[PDB]
Design a protein around this nucleic acid. Sequence first.
RNA 1: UUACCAGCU
Length: 727
Amino acid sequence: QRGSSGQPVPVSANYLPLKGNMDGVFKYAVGFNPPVEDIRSRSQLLNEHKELIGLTRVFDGSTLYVPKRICEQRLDLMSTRQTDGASIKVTISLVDSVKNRDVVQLMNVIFKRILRSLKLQRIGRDYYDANSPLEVPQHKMQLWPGYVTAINRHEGGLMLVLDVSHRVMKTDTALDFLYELYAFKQLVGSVVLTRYNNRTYEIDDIAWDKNPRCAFQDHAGSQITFVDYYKRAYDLDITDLEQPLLIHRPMVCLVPELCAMTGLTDAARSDFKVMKDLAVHTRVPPEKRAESFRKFIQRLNTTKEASELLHSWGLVLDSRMLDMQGRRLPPEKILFKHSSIVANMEADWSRECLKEHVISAVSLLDWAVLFVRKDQGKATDFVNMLSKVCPPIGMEVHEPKMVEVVNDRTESYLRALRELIAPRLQMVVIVFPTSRDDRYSAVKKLCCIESPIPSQVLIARTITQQQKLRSVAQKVALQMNAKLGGELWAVEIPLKSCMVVGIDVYHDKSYGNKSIAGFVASTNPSFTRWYSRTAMQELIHELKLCMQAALKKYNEMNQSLPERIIVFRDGVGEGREEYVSEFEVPQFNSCFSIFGENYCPKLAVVVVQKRITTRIFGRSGHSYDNPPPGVIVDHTITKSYDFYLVSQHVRQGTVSPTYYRVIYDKSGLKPDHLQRLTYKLTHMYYNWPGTIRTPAPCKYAHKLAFLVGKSLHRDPAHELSDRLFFL
RNA sequence: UUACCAGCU
Ligand SMILES: [Mg+2]
Ligand SMILES: [Mg+2]
């Protein structure tokens, strides 16, 4: 159940083993007979009685945890001492000491209280400070240091995972952002925080119907206005008598004039200046992240309340992150038509791809170019450069059919497109003056669904003379050759008569929560051509037909049927992993089996997760740095047949590994032959020459899902299923 | 869309 083929590397991970003083805590169950009545009463009486008997604890309704046995193991109190004056029969019953399963929740509560002791606020699911900000003053911004803490049971033991996060908050006030707007979707996700009390509330509604003159209830129903209360409490005022307000449901009202938005808005997401200004702060190298880790753990063991609480619960934690032994997979041989290039440590061959011929090239006897009269010169020079650069890379290209669209609007483009495309024509390229998503969507709708024509769209800006021409032509020629059903490079995959399948779902709130599911399955021994389908429903029953159709395509192409079927599942949360095993695997097992006669394929189902809080650093001596791409971590953190792989190379900052969780293995593949396989599949992406994060079938499936949900909104035509039209 | 990684009120 463990990999075995790879040279070991020294690595480390942001984890803290917690000492095993677990057995001490004893559990008491509480019982209340006559009134019951909720917590206010439960807290009061339990407080008094159990405090005389003992101190500390957690009591969530019925269960109660205390480190020591109560002075009486069974104790009965008979007085509610409430306003009514009735009686309550308190029944304390000691049960075992603590279950192995139940310790995790207890230490979770304890550590969240510990972190609250340090003055750190809890925003989102994260713990951020509010008195030590890194500040970028250009665009009214800064960063708040943050710690992403979680106590969970991993195979190594009861482990606290720590991770340094940063949360952008704007010095500008919500009133100024509203003035800029003069946006229901944007604010609801953001957790807007108040400035006067430095308290944080997730926002739900943005209501301008209400007015500040309306006064909220307080002091037993007395109506007091917001401005008077804020002046009395926090010593500030609201300048605007009439203003929009924000609503959060626990009736909580937030005033924009004192509210500063956290997070970065969609306009800020698009604006490149904001991203590049933030990146130097938010993106942290590995050495500074290690230094922040050791500063945090030094801070935790020095403050008074935190130091006392840990010894009160009798747990002492290590003083440094965990060290471990990952293994580096050998670099793989990337195979071009007439030469082979072994990728460097950076795992990039973008320069080399320019100078070598593609494996199999669809000779461009004819292709078309649409353009506007303004960019006619741009189109001509681009076509000339493209014709110049193609013969070096093996493709053979002829001069196009050039059509000048009457107007830049998409409708004229469509009117030309219907007449232009023919069964003979292999591809159409399009010139665009402005980058607008609707025009791209209409073009891709015609090209993918309504008519079977692969196509490429180019906005004018990237082709505005200078040295843009060579780079853009060389990075568009390969994309065109990939869209024409031709392969650029290859790697040697030992697996024979295997059909790797990649499933990833793109949750789109806009399109009625359709949960667009991708489905990409190889149809070649060399894993260079693919069959693409997409399943959508309001997945359960469309995956059936997608899988049967893919099996039929493989049978049509290879005159056989596969013995192995490897399924990589993405887009599923950590909680819902068991749901997939319960409901999806048996359905697949029966569904392809029933069609045909006595056909039983193996179905290896592996779940892939990108968003994780685990970090793997490397060292050689004392300095902490990023590990080279291609390192596996399979032991001491992995639980029940999983592993971690680093495959991406980052120019600035640290690497985020990828989690792989084998939820159902019946294929007979070794864990090592699956690890190496999913590493080799990482180089199979034809848009980026080099490695990526997620395996190539899953990345293709994610792009297919994104294209179908964001742009096409329907099923791409079955004619283009064989071609990677979505690249 | 040239292309990869981010009590409060
Ligand atoms: Mg994911
Ligand atoms: Mg593309």
